[PDB]
Structure 1
């Protein structure tokens, strides 16, 4: 970047909020995945929405790419500055506003994480359920279309984002559902909110998200259940869903993942393919759900439930840290993850096949998943200097993605496309789907400067 351009950035946000230092740029050139660090030319921290708009306008009109940056916990290289440009770290805008506990809604700026929001909501009787394992920006979660362990019951970001405030690439300010609006449903015009959820910073910069809040459960019971095989655990999952048990959380760990989590969190669960389960309701409904769910797990050889506030917190903290538990198996490694989501009846085939394919390869892989959604991840751990292994991991990852597509599924349930799944997306939606998404990208970002090289 030219000195005049850097000075123009400083005129918007203040000198302390622009950095061209190599170390600062490198820290903002990668996320939590193995995608190689590609440092932006500068990092900028806008202090309010007017500054976001003015930074975007400056970059856009000068032909400088823009990379929105939340907490950098993505796993598909979304923040990697493949074409250089200006990384906009949005986290200094960290206010919670418009808390409407009678309407079950709240507005959050990009610096607000789920942990911050739920802390703010203590003693309100309400909580925000969508729970990625990382302490991520809620606006970043809206940008990636995130889900979590609670999504099976409480919905994904797509289900729980009611409105978005978006700085469009040329600086215009859009409130997708209208400024200040919040409501349960609408047929008014075209739904713009859903277009920006899962847009990954390629259509605009989310500067606030209006979120649906949920009532805290009357009572909570968590447990683990060990199974003799992956087949038995996944058949149990499908049967629980087909029986319509309204489970709050149903998470799968294969034996490799279970052992990794044991070693990383001081859990002592039997090393086996395992379901972590949670149930919400009254004492009467809990007993009913438990009895129907234990009957199904027993049919498939599940252990008697190992019951788990502080043990439950310990259980879910270990699950939330599964990514790092995997990484700890091979110190110094980075990881790539698959994220397929298939029709639930096909989940047994593809999980068992994935386990068999991992075993037949020399690759280390841990399997963990939001199986209540028909979704799972294979975390594939790689030596950053071993080029040949990564090609095998990439090849394994595409082949699994294509297998999910053959089953009528999707290549990503929650993580997004970023740099890693662009070819899979083309196969998933075909030429008319690709052209339609690209036309939408072009009307919002004519110059192609809004996080270039990602998604499409």
Structure 2
């Protein structure tokens, strides 16, 4: 990367906000995945959208790859600079604006985390529900198409992103639904917002997200329920969903995950467990609990172990399940699977996955959003090239089993570097060419986070 180019970057954002230092680049060359660190040639912190546009235009016209960087909590190598280039850390743009409580909407810049937003909204009676375990950038969550434990009731990022401000690869500024617009529904033209949700930084740089806010629940009850087997817990899950109980949260942990979480945080019985949460009025809760306890009882579930601070403890342990797993073998890294299948096929694949983890030398824990037909296998890897090949082969086989059942290889994490072949199988030749034609019209030179997704 030439000295003239670095000085041009410094001319846009200021000398303090450009770094070519080795350690700074290394810190921005990886996320939380096992994908090997690949340092960008420089890291740049734009201070406003004009600077984002001018950095993008400078890189694009000079043939320099651009890697958008939020909080670096992704798990598929999205920020890995496989072709070098300029990593654009967006987190100094950290303002909440256009809070419209009467309309249930707000605009956030990339440095705003869900934590920061919900802190800002305390006493408003509103909250933002999409809750990945990590303290992630909300714009990063829009970029990956994130979901979380609350999604079964309150929707994913795709459900809750109403508008996006995007700096396109050559620097042009796009407001996907129109500048300043926010509304409940539209048929006006082609929906551009949904194209950029889940684009992972390969179609442009998200510099603000307009989010749907939700009313805080009238009352909240959380509980855990222990089961004799994986089959019993997942059958209960499917039957709760088919009974249309509007559960707020329904999270599965197998016995391995439960023990890991116990050890890293809880003293739940070591068993396949559902973490449950219900929202409503006092009477609406009693109805929901009654119908849900009946279904769990039919499948051998324990009487509910009930959970303010205790509920926060419960969900904090769930949100840290990734780190609880890693702690089973210190020094190791991890790869998460993320398949999502038609709910009626969830019992087969989860039970089969549990059986396949037992039959192998791999250490794996199972956790996730079974209310969506989605789950994660957290596979530990010693950074033992043979173990890492066995983990990667396990992940691909599980992905292909999900595709065989009519499902998808990723419910929320994305494709990044890890699932590019699975995506080709998932949508076929015409799906791939169509996605690539979309990529090519927005990023003709292929400089917008190259090597990812497609």
Q: How does the TM-score come out when normalised to structure 1?
A: 0.99
Give, in whole Å, the separation in 1 of the partners of 2:212 and 2:332.
Answer: 37
* Aligned partner of residue 102 in structure 1, secondary structure: helix
Q: Does 1:340 align with 2:342?
A: no
Deviations 1:204-229 (A, max 9, x none): 00000000000000000000000000
Task: Provide the residue aligned with 2:450 in structure 1.
Answer: 452
Q: Does 1:232 align with 2:232?
A: yes
* Aligned-residue offset at 1:276: 0.1
Task: Provide the residue aligned with 1:305 in structure 2.
Answer: 304
* Aligned-residue offset at 1:39: 0.1
* Aligned partner of residue 323 in structure 2, secondary structure: helix
* Aligned-residue offset at 1:395: 0.2
Deviations 1:44-65 (A, max 9, x none): 0000000000000000000000
Give, in whole Å, the separation in 2 of the partners of 1:272 and 1:15.
Answer: 55
Deviations 1:53-110 (A, max 9, x none): 0000000000000000000000000000000000000000000000000000000000
Q: Does 1:187 align with 2:168?
A: no
* Aligned-residue offset at 1:195: 0.1
Give, in whole Å, the separation in 1 of the partners of 2:246 and 2:449.
Answer: 39
Deviations 1:115-137 (A, max 9, x none): 00000000000000000000000
Deviations 1:340-380 (A, max 9, x none): 00000000000000000000000000000100000000000
* Aligned-residue offset at 1:389: 0.2
How many residues of Structure 1 are paired with residues of Structure 2 in the alignment?
Answer: 454
Pairwise mapping of residues 38-187 of structure 1 onto structure 2 (< 5 A)? 38-187=38-187
Task: Provide the residue aligned with 1:330 in structure 2.
Answer: 329
* Aligned-residue offset at 1:313: 0.2
Deviations 1:234-276 (A, max 9, x none): 00000000000000000000000000000001x0000000000
Give, in whole Å, the separation in 2 of the partners of 1:448 and 1:338.
Answer: 28
Give, in whole Å, the separation in 2 of the partners of 1:19 and 1:352.
Answer: 49
Q: Considering only aligned residues, what root-mean-square deviation do their CA atoms show, in Å?
A: 0.2
Q: What stretches of structure 1 of length at least 5 have no aligned partner?
A: none
Give, in whole Å, the separation in 1 of the partners of 2:24 and 2:270.
Answer: 41
* Aligned-residue offset at 1:443: 0.1
Give, in whole Å, the separation in 2 of the partners of 1:73 and 1:417.
Answer: 14
Moved over 6 A (4+): none
Deviations 1:144-176 (A, max 9, x none): 000000000000000000000000000000000
Give, in whole Å, the separation in 1 of the partners of 2:15 and 2:26.
Answer: 19
* Aligned-residue offset at 1:295: 0.1
Give, in whole Å, the separation in 2 of the partners of 1:313 and 1:10.
Answer: 44
* Aligned-residue offset at 1:325: 0.3
* Aligned-residue offset at 1:302: 0.2
